[PDB]
């Protein structure tokens, strides 16, 4: 697949290809890879669909009981670290995104259980391609107009250049509150 | 691929399936597993189609050319020597029925090149499924009409009973005087 995330001024944002092909054949393009956990944090799966879905739901549980336990919202580094601590036992890499600090933190947890913090992670097969656009076209923080065009753009080139990912676009700017939601079909013009 | 052929009271009668397959999906609704090596001798190969079209071409022309080069009708056993020698040099079974100075001879030819004269024969996936019905009802010196109905029966059984075999049938009565083909036995 193909997942993208980066933080401009107004928040962290999340973008993705909805295609989910089992081999050369396409099982589905309706598939949703973006998942919410805590009301403010969310993650994107990349790689295998079943294991990634499992670990996301599992994360939702552990986070949920924690959130019930302290009666509050946990910091994003926590939710990263739990997967870093469980995955190391064994899958598929993932990206996390959320708000605890005045800036939204971003993370990326490898199937190796490697954890990484940073500003513009991307993953999935086509990661490299948008991943060029992310500094050639985003060396620094910008605007929501600039950003939704940016992610829609970088996803489009990760859609054209990679046969392993495509389908619909689905960008999700995150407000300090929760998040927004946007979905698109083909946009070659 | 079933291929069943059987001797009658004066003529070999060959019959065969007509459906190529790539292994999973079928890759043809029809094919020719009853090649005509000569007017009074045919081959019915089973196996890889490629190797079959090859050696049957080379065989047909070795036999037609040799017939041009000599008086005698290319008596059936020479085809068997040529084919078996070719396969021996090295994947495709064959079943060949011809009629000549001897009897209506019929042969079966294994992928390693082994030859055997046979009263009745089958090869391919359907072979088992054809050996079942074929052997049960066989009798030497059947009326050729009995060949006409039987060989279609054993073919239909070796069709319905395999995933790898199916489609329309075709049958022919290789009389020494003449082949009598029909494109769809079904």
């Amino acid at each position: 697949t193909t997942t993208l995330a980066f933080k401009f001024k107004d928040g962290i944002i999340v973008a993705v290809d909805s295609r989910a092909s089992m081999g050369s054949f396409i099982s589905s393009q309706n598939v949703e890879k973006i998942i919410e956990i805590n009301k403010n944090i969310l993650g994107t799966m990349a790689g295998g669909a079943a294991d990634c879905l499992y670990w996301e739901k599992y994360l939702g549980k552990i986070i949920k009981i924690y959130e019930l336990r302290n009666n509050e919202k946990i910091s994003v580094r926590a939710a990263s670290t739990i997967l870093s601590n469980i995955l190391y036992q064994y899958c598929c890499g993932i990206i996390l995104s959320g708000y605890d600090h005045t800036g939204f933190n971003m993370f990326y947890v490898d199937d190796s259980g490697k954890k990484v913090e940073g500003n513009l992670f991307s993953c999935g097969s086509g990661s490299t391609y948008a991943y060029s656009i992310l500094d050639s076209a985003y060396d620094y923080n910008l605007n929501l107009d600039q950003a939704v065009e940016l992610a829609r753009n970088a996803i489009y080139h990760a859609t054209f250049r990679d046969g392993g990912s495509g389908g619909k676009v689905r960008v999700f700017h995150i407000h300090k509150n929760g998040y927004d939601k946007i979905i698109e079909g083909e946009d070659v013009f | 691929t079933t291929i069943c052929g059987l001797v009658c009271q004066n003529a070999v009668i060959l019959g065969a399936d007509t459906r190529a397959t790539e292994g999973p999906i079928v890759a043809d609704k029809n094919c020719s597993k009853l090649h005509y090596i000569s007017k009074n001798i045919w081959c019915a190969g089973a196996g890889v189609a490629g190797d079959l079209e090859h050696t049957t071409l080379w065989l047909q022309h070795n036999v037609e050319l040799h017939r041009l080069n000599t008086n005698t009708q290319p008596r059936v056993s020479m085809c068997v020597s040529r084919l078996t020698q070719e396969l021996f040099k090295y994947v495709c079974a064959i079943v060949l029925g011809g009629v000549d100075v001897n009897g209506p001879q019929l042969y079966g030819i294994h992928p390693h090149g082994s030859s055997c004269l046979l009263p009745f024969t089958a090869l391919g996936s359907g072979s088992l499924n054809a050996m079942a019905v074929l052997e049960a009802k066989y009798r030497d010196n059947m009326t050729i009409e009995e060949g006409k109905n039987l060989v279609c029966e054993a073919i239909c059984a070796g069709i319905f009973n395999d995933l790898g075999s199916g489609g329309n049938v075709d049958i022919c009565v290789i009389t020494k005087d003449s082949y009598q083909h029909i494109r769809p036995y079904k």
Partner: protein
């Protein structure tokens, strides 16, 4: 690799994907064109590995031009096709894969499809070698009507393409569809 060949009342149609992606299906190219013209009434659509495609169409270019000049008649499709089967069979190794499709009037339309060893199917109707072939036989088996005008047959073959390309990751952009009649040839690009 993705190739089609519908047949018509007074026509034949041939089509393809135009992508020649590399390993992990990254699209290294989108203008690649497997269809070729060996003759005004004879076409071949190659598929499978692209190296073997250019080498093969190249050798046909050779031996067919050689025969047409050596013997004045434009080559009949049965000749080009049986000879083609003869060509691949000499060595499996030469094409690690290739799946030729041969098409054209002979003015009865002639549609045949070789296997990479030279196994061959001389069909009376459509045949569809290609990496996306299952989707092809799947759509075209039921969509097909015996005989049609070149445009309805065009939208037909186009619906088999438009359908198949969206199920396969390796299927290309575009469509080099190529309806033809003995006196005319109509290529088009569909998106």
């Amino acid at each position: 690799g993705c190739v089609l060949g519908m047949s018509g009342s007074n026509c034949v149609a041939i089509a393809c994907d135009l992508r020649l992606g590399a390993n992990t299906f990254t699209t290294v190219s989108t203008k690649f064109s497997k269809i070729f013209k060996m003759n005004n009434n004879v076409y071949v659509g190659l598929s499978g590995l692209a190296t073997d495609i250019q080498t093969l169409y190249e050798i046909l270019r050779y031996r067919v031009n050689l025969y047409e000049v050596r013997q004045d008649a434009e080559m009949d499709v049965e000749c080009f096709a049986n000879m083609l089967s003869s060509i691949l069979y000499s060595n499996r190794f030469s094409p690690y894969f290739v799946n030729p499709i041969v098409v054209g009037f002979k003015y009865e339309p002639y549609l045949t499809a070789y296997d990479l060893i030279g196994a061959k199917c001389e069909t009376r109707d459509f045949v569809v070698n290609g990496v996306t072939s299952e989707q092809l036989f799947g759509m075209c088996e039921s969509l097909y009507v015996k005989d049609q005008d070149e445009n309805g047959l065009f939208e037909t073959i186009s619906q088999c393409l438009l359908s198949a390309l969206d199920r396969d990751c390796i299927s290309g952009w575009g469509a080099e569809v190529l309806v033809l009649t003995p006196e005319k040839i109509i290529k088009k690009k569909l998106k």
